[PDB]
Amino acid sequence: RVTTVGDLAVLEGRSVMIPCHYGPQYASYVKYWCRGSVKDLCTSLVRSDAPRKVVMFDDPVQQVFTVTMTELQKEDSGWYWCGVEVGGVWSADVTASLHINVIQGLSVVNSMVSGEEGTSVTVQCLYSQGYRQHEKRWCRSGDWSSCLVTDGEGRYEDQAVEIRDDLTKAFTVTLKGLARRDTGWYWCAAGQQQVAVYILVTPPSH
């Protein structure tokens, strides 16, 4: 038995850390990480016996080997396999697949953010590598003229809203003091890509 996580979606430029868990029989065998939709036609990318891009760490005591793939590119999308190198065992017992979809655009940590009127909330907008140099914007849905846009230093600030772009992976939008009219749909956006975020402002408490 070899098992791993379910299919993944990751923004271009980010890394993944994949556990390949295996049964206690397989502690002593070489572990490998394979790419291809068809196990019998796959290409080995890294092995646990390599002499001393992708990193492998087999931990027999925890009965898992961990595969790290860094700086993923869109062309890295596809099927991958955890494998144990052992002869004379059913291939299904010593391999496990998963699909990695490397995406270009934006995503959001939490697409529903709520807070009491008069308090502050933060939205964390994530973006893939191709948007590092784009101005970032926060817009109210339905209102083109409402966008608040970062400057050349990745910054926007007025009385109500601050945007801080870390210039590599994410920009945060801080709504500094919610009013109940702020409830509704918004966009994190860069270039022609966007991700929807809902803000729910709840009543002030006694």
Numbering used by the authors: 1 to 52, 61 to 214
Reproduce passages from the article.
Protection is conferred largely through the function of the polymeric Immunoglobulin receptor (pIgR), which transports and stabilizes secretory antibodies and also functions as an innate immune factor. The transport cycle of pIgR starts when pIgR at the basolateral membrane binds dIgA or pIgM, and the resulting complex is transcytosed to the apical surface where proteases cleave the pIgR ectodomain (now referred to as secretory component, SC), releasing it into the mucosa as a complex with dIgA or pIgM. SC specifically protects secretory Ig from proteolytic degradation and confers innate recognition functions upon SIgA and SIgM, allowing them to bind and exclude bacteria. Here we report the first crystal structures of intact SC proteins, comparing the highly-evolved five-domain human SC (hSC) and a two-domain teleost fish SC (tSC), a relative of the first vertebrate SC ancestor.
To compare SC structures across evolution and to facilitate the design of chimeric proteins for characterizing SC-ligand interactions, we solved the 1.7Å crystal structure of teleost fish SC (tSC) (Rcryst = 18.5%; Rfree = 21.5%). Teleost fish express the oldest recognizable pIgR protein, which transports polymeric versions of IgM and IgT/IgZ (a teleost Ig specialized in mucosal immunity) to the mucosa. In addition, tSC contains just two extracellular domains, tD1 and tD2. tD1 and tD2 share homology with mammalian D1 and D5, respectively, but CDR loop residues implicated in mammalian SC interactions with pIg are not conserved. The structure of tSC revealed two tandem Ig-like domains related by ~90°. Like hSC domains D1 and D3-D5, tSC domains are IgSF folds that include the canonical B to F strand disulfide bond and a second disulfide bond linking the C and C’ strands. tD1 and tD2 share a similar topology, but only 72 of 97 Cα atoms could be aligned (rmsd = 0.87Å). Aligning fish and human SC domains resulted in rmsds of 0.77Å for tD1 and D1 (83 of 100 Cα atoms) and 1.08Å for tD2 and D5 (64 of 97 Cα atoms). The largest structural differences between tSC and hSC domains are in regions between the C’ and D strands, where tD1 residues at positions similar to the C” strand are disordered and the tD2 C” strand hydrogen bonds to the D strand on the A-B-E-D face rather than to the C’ strand on the A’-G-F-C face, similar to other IgSF proteins such as IREMs (immune receptors expressed on myeloid cells). In contrast to the human D1 CDR1 α-helical turn, both tSC CDR1 loops include a 310 helical turn and are structurally similar to human D5 CDR1. The interface between the two tSC domains is formed by residues in the tD1 A’-B and E-F loops and residues in tD2 CDR1 and DE loop, burying a total surface area of 591Å2. Ten of the 17 residues in the interface are well conserved among representative fish species, and five inter-domain hydrogen bonds may limit inter-domain flexibility.
